[PDB]
Design a protein around this ligand. Sequence first.
Ligand SMILES: Cc1cc2nc3c(=O)[nH]c(=O)nc-3n(C[C@H](O)[C@H](O)[C@H](O)COP(=O)(O)O)c2cc1C
Ligand code: SF4
Ligand code: SF4
Ligand code: SF4
Ligand code: FES
Ligand code: FES
Lengths: 60, 227, 439, 156
Amino acid sequence: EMGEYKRQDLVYEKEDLLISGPGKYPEYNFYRMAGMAIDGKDKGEAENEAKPIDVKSLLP
Amino acid sequence: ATIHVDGKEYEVNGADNLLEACLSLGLDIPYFCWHPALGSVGACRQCAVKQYQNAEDTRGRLVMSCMTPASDGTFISIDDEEAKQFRESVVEWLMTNHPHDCPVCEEGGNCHLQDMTVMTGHSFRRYRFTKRTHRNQDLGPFISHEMNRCIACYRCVRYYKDYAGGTDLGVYGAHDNVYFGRPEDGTLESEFSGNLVEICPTGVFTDKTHSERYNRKWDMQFAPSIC
Amino acid sequence: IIRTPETHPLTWRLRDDKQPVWLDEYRSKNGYEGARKALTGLSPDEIVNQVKDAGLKGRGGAGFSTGLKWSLMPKDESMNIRYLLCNADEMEPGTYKDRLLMEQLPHLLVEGMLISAFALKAYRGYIFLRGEYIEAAVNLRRAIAEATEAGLLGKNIMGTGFDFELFVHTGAGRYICGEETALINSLEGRRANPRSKPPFPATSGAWGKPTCVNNVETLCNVPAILANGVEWYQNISKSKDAGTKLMGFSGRVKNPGLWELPFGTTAREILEDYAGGMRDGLKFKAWQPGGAGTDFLTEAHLDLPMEFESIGKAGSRLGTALAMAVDHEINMVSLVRNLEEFFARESCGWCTPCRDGLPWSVKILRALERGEGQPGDIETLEQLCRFLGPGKTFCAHAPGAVEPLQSAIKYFREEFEAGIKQPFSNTHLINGIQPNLLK
Amino acid sequence: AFELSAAEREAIEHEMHHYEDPRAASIEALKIVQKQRGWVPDGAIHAIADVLGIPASDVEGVATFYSQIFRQPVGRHVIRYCDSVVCHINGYQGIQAALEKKLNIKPGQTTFDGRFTLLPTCCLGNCDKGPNMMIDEDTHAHLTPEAIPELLERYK
Ligand SMILES: Cc1cc2nc3c(=O)[nH]c(=O)nc-3n(C[C@H](O)[C@H](O)[C@H](O)COP(=O)(O)O)c2cc1C
Ligand code: SF4
Ligand code: SF4
Ligand code: SF4
Ligand code: FES
Ligand code: FES
């Protein structure tokens, strides 16, 4: 049910497409897989990522 | 000089290496560490082709086409099964530690590693262990740094030191903890530091000015202009 | 066991209290007579021809002849600046010959470099020494000072007119520094990434100048050749390799040690007689002939002469000829895991296959240790063996790294399949997406 | 806030006299600074760079390339135990367990008082007398886990 009166009102902006929950995929989170550091997710906290080792570390 | 690639005869410049000679004829060979303006170092081991000693040979030998001269009567093969398997294995080795960053990476659609991954036909992952990570430096207002996406092809250090003459970028570290950057934070003081965003085949050095208002390469409208 | 000079040209003048033989005792025990003969009555080309006729091969495991390497110098007088390098790094595990041979006999190495520099017209020699040999560095510097005050080093050496200077460059502990091109790069104060050959170091080596890099044992075999003759040197033992070698077994044996033996000596005589066999309650399972970078061998190959050609067609390398014995109690998975961990933590990080394939094999062996192996791990190790061969990688560290893995796969495959327990899981379930259940 | 001493600078110059390229003395300069300081700090890279005349990127790459050149602060003594293959056959793991239950640290960290820094190291060239362990100037061989408490207590 998306029929409209004016054709200009069929242009759905970002506030007309963003819903409250995950929809059909309830658990996938991309930024848990991505390697870039964001808020609440430091380098090495992503999935299958080791902690970053500095080049100045004493291990050989 | 005369070369025979996959049973096809070609005429090339005799003072060129095999990689640039085969690239000038339209033949496709994957390569990372070689640049036409920087020379050859044989680092990435991606440009492997099977060279035969004479016209009638079956064994051959996997050689670096960026390090092999294109002398007269050189018989090589690009699409041999051993060469293609080795190139796919090199791509797979480069993909073991590579971050899952392509949607959020400024080089997506312009990435040499993406094209060389697709061209070698590598699309199935079997490496299941952890991936190494690195902290990112601050290189100034123009260059944005992401060391996670590096493949250690040494293009940046070679250009920035041998070509650009810069002094504040280098390779540090060890076996697989190589770090390409400044010894500390700060702006790259070279006057030709901006070419790193095109020299680097990956998303390590990115145009931060472009990365602010970012769009992809297929979404751009270009024109050939003069600076 | 006595050591006459006729069959022990290197270790006959050793001391029982393991004390360094200094200049007076070395000169009393036939010291610098070969150097005097070379620098007085022999042309440098005559010394090169004598070395080439002696059949002196590379003692670093490569087997390259010293005369052919010395003959690769250009004959141009414009390239007069020539360099001599002594590879006293000895960074390979299971290799302890250079420590013994230069801790108590440094003047032998000094004399050998003097002869080799006069035969090559090289005015400077550098001993690239590892940083862990503190006592050896002190003894070498004291021997250099004693030779300098006696007129054996410096300007106008023994009244001849040849000027030669000697230095000791202490390395900073990296295994790839033992590679000769990487040794040159580390000598120049750079990162020890190796160089691509051609050009060889004989044409453009140290700072572009012509350079010859030689092992410690080759430079110690040189004065015996130059002092006791060449035809005597070829008549030490009836074998394909003239001269003797520092050989011995190590690892859970009754008498671990080092002995100077002629070539062609089988490993069982080194084990059962010199080393006294295995220890109490330890049955012999495997052995490595040439240190950590060589193929493992079993008891069937123990009755075989230890030469370059004898081990070359056997499926391994002679190497440094310092063998290692493994009993049953050492799990081969853990042993290969430690070997690959050493080879993956000492890579120089230049080229892709070694740098990004040895950590994968290390992680696979770590999973095999804990029983977390999955179907497709041994195939991955075999692919690593196939694609890290001679010429696939930039330098020769990675073929020597993957040789023990291929030998343990060939001879001890039953211990690797005992670590594969769980099925091949690579992806986790994503709710809402039906996976592509391939066959 | 790093100032090179006169003795360090003259030692670096004397090592520079032995090479036709002053870049060749970078490793020995780093080792001199490490010997005089225990570890190589951040400003020492730039100090060696402008003493030698080479860019600091090369000095940093050399310092981080080699394992025996320390770039992070350590304790007053560095325990360097051989974890290679001959000492593995001779059982270095018992020695590592003894060191770990004594110092109560992990390989790569320092004690809370800054006395010992536990570190695995490469082959020490003493494989026939394995296992071996390296303290600052001494190499100990024929190790047993029972002799480790007697060995560690003599290094203050
Ligand atoms: C990874 C690697 C490590 C090496 N380490 C040493 C070493 O520690 N000592 C040595 O004499 N040769 C070593 N070599 C061999 C050298 O490349 C070279 O053969 C040697 O320095 C001189 O050869 P020579 O035996 O004819 O004198 C190593 C080679 C490789 C590939
Ligand atoms: S940062 Fe880029 S140019 Fe430099 S080595 Fe890595 S991938 Fe190559
Ligand atoms: S550099 Fe290339 S492969 Fe890496 S995340 Fe960016 S687009 Fe993907
Ligand atoms: S195989 Fe490659 S990365 Fe490994 S030590 Fe040699 S050059 Fe360096
Ligand atoms: S392009 Fe030839 S090895 Fe990199
Ligand atoms: S293996 Fe430990 S000293 Fe050589």
